[model samples]
Target: HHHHNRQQIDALVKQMNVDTAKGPVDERIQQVVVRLLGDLFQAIEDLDIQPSEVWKGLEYLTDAGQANELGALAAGLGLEHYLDLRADEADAKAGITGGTPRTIEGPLYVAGAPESVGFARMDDGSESDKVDTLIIEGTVTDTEGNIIEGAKVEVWHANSLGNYSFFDKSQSDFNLRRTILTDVNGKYVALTTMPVGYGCPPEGTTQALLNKLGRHGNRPSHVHYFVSAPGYRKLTTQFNIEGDEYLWDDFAFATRDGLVATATDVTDEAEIARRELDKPFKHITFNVELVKEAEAAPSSEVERRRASA
Candidate 1:
């Protein structure tokens, strides 16, 4: 019976892919749709999915779209992390080895951030007294340990309340987003407030599905980075701050071994005064190593519609 169902699904998918009145048929899209439809149909048959279950699934997707939580759902479902794994495999096959490990670019990136040469104050002083001061410094270097000056390091993170800037309207524009170009010494620094961990909206669609799956929708405190340089592969990676409850249990599954950064407490009075700070601060160092682009390697850039502000 399963064999017969599979054969029927294949025939139906073939019919569905026939472009009867197409001016220009995208063969690639058609091929992908055909395969996906076949698998979905086979699954429905194999599982004896009821009509009510199918309707419930559709309604859940509708709710997710209405709430604009599809991106969260994608991450919670591990689809984003799965793509990173595939990219890693592709890189290994292309002999592009030994560099910073790539990770998922979460859905909250906004372009056109204020750019600086070597350092930038990412926060707007809104949470200065409310949160710990964070000084994140990093040096960009090639896999061979040579400094790569002029590399662009774009960074963003949530505010102290676990809410992003643009996404949360109450925050100032570009409150915690900045792009810093590596100086002659390949060093870039960002002075910002400590970001807090966040969870999927407790009452939202993504959490609804996660609840049904007996899972929690939580992500560790982390900072996202886009480090790119001329003649090098653009790296989309982020580092989870150490000691978060969800550090190893990130629902997005974005935490990796080498990407965890420890935040050291700086309490020496002289050291604090050296940076002209009235109080102690948290210091985090995340050095980046970029892989050189190879002619035969697949493009590292992932094309998707992103917001700009």
Candidate 2:
């Protein structure tokens, strides 16, 4: 990931400052790339101002990976969360608000799928032993509170053993994740397995380095959701259980007070009949209210024009 990130940064910078060039295929993309590279270079300069953290950064990241969690160093240090926060801040200032609470897009996301009312127990729309027997529901509404008749929802997560398909070939192609769409009512739910602690890929460069640092890879139980609709903002976030001792002190710093949930114990029969939860287990639900864009736009517009280029 870092390699790719650096490559992108370099490529953008190269294009943005070429001595002679026709510019990007799209001006918008070119401008965005230039701005993005400007900031990227600025951060590199600012954060690397003091050249003493190489060893410390290595040790810190090594342990973070060993913990088998993605958010540890990245989210906890505000690398992930802070980036989202700033982007949210820009949207707030730009009158581009509304939709669900924008959360970090974790490393486990996949794109492209047929739209459905919701996902199911299996990764690619089937049943499995590791399925958690739970139902997850949410609504899709525009900035003006109008329900989106049909919206795309992509869901993914770790298995009970904390592994993803691509990383762990033991699982199917879409092993711990799948995609679905909102129903007619702009509401949707997914019946799937619970996500357990996920560890780092065993044979990657990151893992190879972590092995020498005396660390183990493991993440807490969690579920990832990506919901999108027209006239609404995209939502990428995760829901977690509250009882995890590591919630407040997550190695990935991904869990916040609002993201954790309290338990709601339910039976398999009731779950199947009512909530579509076919297995009996502790069930806890947490609802998130997204701020609408129209409500936020007027303020953002005023500020934008007032700035007066």
Candidate 3:
């Protein structure tokens, strides 16, 4: 009887819940995850899924893992956004307040970049092509609006040609990525070419999957950030370059309320000359506000370096 199958599954889930976990395994984690896996197998059996379909799914996953495109897969399918959704729910339930809004941590973050103070130049000093220039400077503050001096701010973004370092062999190591520590005033400045919106690998497996679903694989122009201070909870966010077509339609579903930056076209030499930068640079001011940490995690490598150096 069909009812008998449900009875068997219920009994197995009950037995597994109380079973002792093997060496080094977390008992509750093992119990819940094993139960989920058992339910999945039962569903497959119930649906009579063929071996060919199952094998194809496994093969696609194997390729996804090897190519490091799992992030693309996750974002495309909204898992990354879904994780942020749950995090927002938790923060709300806990009554967390203030600080910069969190955004999706996309696939292209690299840590341990060379650190500097006040200002840093992201370019490698050799340029064959150029795009709209950008100058970003701002201070770090707590939710109370007090300056957080010496906060470590980590940044990475797609390049002028819309390619990220490490993932794009053409770019130098950490080409558009750098770590800058705040000055005594809690301010940091950086000069780099403005990045444009980027698209998925044109002919890659992820793109193929998107094609099947009739979805365009493009992300809006954005600069990524991870701001942390000694007594503050780490803040992960991004600044969406205003006026991009994909701003509202980011394929990764990363754009969120209050994440767009204020962009201004400046031709006046007063602001440009003061920084020794030439005229006609796009200026963006983004102040990062962090939350005071009650339960702190171990200091990231950048934080340690900020203290030691």
Candidate 4:
């Protein structure tokens, strides 16, 4: 915007594909955005957001890029956030069952993170004390009671110290995330540790916004799961630890009542068998209640099957 040079703006407008001066929703929005941005620039001279606010914003943006930490402004719109909202809206409108409140997809979901038949551990050779061992078993079913076989279950989460791979130089690659296909019974289980609460990046737009509210940037101990299958709607969601002090105080508003897990201390015998007894690790289990499309359809499948028969 370079101090809003009229000549530069006119020249750039011509260079843009199809000048937005033409009427259209997209073009109109683009023009409005440009005008609004121009206003903001002009207002900075009069201290619209605050004297020197524009320059301060630029400085913060520069630092945000320099930090380039996870959860940073990879861009203004988070693809995960958008996909989460889109999936939720689609499920709601389609009346499919088992769709939970979606949350931001983290940066740790790798395509090929150690898959197993039915059960697996999220840790990939990291010797951190943070990963706990507990079995997660659940049934994928529709609104009725029929089980859903061939469901794909994926899990990714921050490590014991609340750091995710690719962001934390200290953690091993794919330290704690994996996938497991469900059995014929529609059951899937993974043995993994619980996550702990942590703050936002040391500095970034997200943090900048959080700081103004005088709120802590801590997120609840949680993990993300992407569940889907043939003929089933998609699910991108996360589970949080109940009774955590930060459960009620998520910076991103990602926590849901049904997604919270009940924590307990496993018996020492079970802990020793699970190999998680050395430390006083806490445990939590959560169930995923999935909704299906047929049950959500305008007509019941039984009627169609009857007609075919």
Q: Pick the candidate with the highest lDDT.
A: 1
Best by TM-score: 1
What's the candidate order when arranged by decreasing lDDT? 1, 3, 4, 2
Candidate 1 off by > 4 Å: 1-4, 19-23
> What C-alpha RMSD separates each model from the true structure?
1.5, 9.9, 4.3, 9.0
Compose the digit string of candidate 4's lDDT tens values, residues 176-219: 76777877887777766667777776555666765776766677
Off by over 4 Å in 2: 1-78, 95-99, 123-132, 142-146, 201-218, 268-279, 284-309
- Per-residue lDDT tens digits for candidate 3, residues 24-78, read 8777887688778678667766887677988987888888878777778988888
At residue 295, candidate 1 shows an lDDT of: 91
- The ten-residue window of minimal lDDT in model 2 covers 300-309
The whole-model lDDT of each prediction reads 0.92, 0.58, 0.80, 0.63
Put down candidate 2 lDDT per residue, 1-309, tens digits, no spaces: 123355566666876564346645666866686778667565665566333655665575676566644443354334777776777688767766444455665555554433455444445544455555555666666655666656766767777667766646676666656566666777766666666666556765445544676654445677777665555445667777767655555535567556776656666585457764345755545443444435444321111111000
> Using Cα atoms with residue i matched to residue i, what is each candidate's TM-score against the true structure?
0.96, 0.62, 0.87, 0.70
Model with the higher TM-score, candidate 2 or 4: 4
Runs off by more than 4 Å, candidate 4: 1-52, 69-98, 124-132, 203-205, 268-283, 293-309
At residue 180, give the lDDT of candidate 4: 78
Angstrom error at residue 255, model 4: 0.8
Q: Pick the winner on lDDT between candidates 1 and 2.
A: 1
- Candidate 3 weakest ten by summed lDDT: 300-309
